[PDB]
Amino acid sequence: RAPDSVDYRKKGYVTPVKNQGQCGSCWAFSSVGALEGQLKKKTGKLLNLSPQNLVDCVSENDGCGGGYMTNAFQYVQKNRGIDSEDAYPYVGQEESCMYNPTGKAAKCRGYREIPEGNEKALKRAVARVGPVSVAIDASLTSFQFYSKGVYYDESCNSDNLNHAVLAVGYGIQKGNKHWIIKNSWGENWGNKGYILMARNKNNACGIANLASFPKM
Numbered sequence: 097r098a099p100d101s102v103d104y105r106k107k108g109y110v111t112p113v114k115n116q117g118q119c120g121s122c123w124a125f126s127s128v129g130a131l132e133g134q135l136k137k138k139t140g141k142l143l144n145l146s147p148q149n150l151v152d153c154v155s156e157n158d159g160c161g162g163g164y165m166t167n168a169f170q171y172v173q174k175n176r177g178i179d180s181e182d183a184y185p186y187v188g189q190e191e192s193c194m195y196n197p198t199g200k201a202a203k204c205r206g207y208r209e210i211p212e213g214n215e216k217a218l219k220r221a222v223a224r225v226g227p228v229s230v231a232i233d234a235s236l237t238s239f240q241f242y243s244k245g246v247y248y249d250e251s252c253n254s255d256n257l258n259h260a261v262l263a264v265g266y267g268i269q270k271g272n273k274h275w276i277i278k279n280s281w282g283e284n285w286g287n288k289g290y291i292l293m294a295r296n297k298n299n300a301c302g303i304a305n306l307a308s309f310p311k312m
């Protein structure tokens with residue numbers, strides 16, 4: 097069995113919470129979070145990678161109009177690299193692709209998908225691999241006002257995925273099982289930019305419906 101709780105923040109695999117601003121770039125933050133995890137695991141280095149690189153250059157995605165993490169990992173593969181945040185800083189508006197090989201800070205050898213709706217497999221992937229990119233319904237007012245505790249809302253729609261976040265761990269808070277979720281809505285949203293989302297409550301908010309992680 098994988099451990100009963102895992103928190104990659106404790107192991108230095110997770111960079112500070114970012115703010116996407118007025119740009120539908122959640123998919124780009126999710127993607128860099130998962131690549132930042134694999135980079136810490138494989139090199140021992142924790143550094144901010146470049147969401148802007150993905151926003152401006154993933155031509156299969158729609159920049160500030162939205163995107164998929166799988167598309168981003170395929171781009172980092174084909175492109176033979178992703179820049180550091182330092183070499184390709186975040187603007188929060190879509191600009192023409194300015195990828196600079198000099199600033200390359202990680203590569204990607206492909207990616208894997210979690211079987212759709214399978215929270216057991218998502219748990220094993222987080223334990224075995226590290227932080228995993230996930231998609232959720234974040235449309236509910238209850239989501240936007242989250243403060244503390246383990247978030248569950250029966251009105252959450254697992255067939256309405258509209259937001260990309262990062263599962264950096266999982267655990268059990270006073271008997272309530274959860275996913276530890278890094279958002280990209282700033283340090284002052286939720287609990288310092290994080291939300292605990294209900295785990296093993298019938299794929300709540302579709303947490304295991306579009307999960308993926310990069311190979312490195």
Ligand SMILES: *[C@@H](CNC(=O)[C@H](CC(C)C)NC(=O)OC(C)(C)C)CC(=O)N(Cc1ccccc1)Cc1ccccc1
Nearest residue numbers: 118119120121122123161162163231234235257258259260
């Ligand atoms: C970030 C925008 N979402 C996406 O990119 C989705 C991610 C999938 C994994 C679900 N993909 C998508 O829609 O791609 C296509 C190709 C355009 C279809 C999520 C986000 O921050 N926002 C969306 C949202 C909508 C309702 C309630 C909560 C969140 C909010 C947002 C939008 C624009 C600017 C800033 C924030």
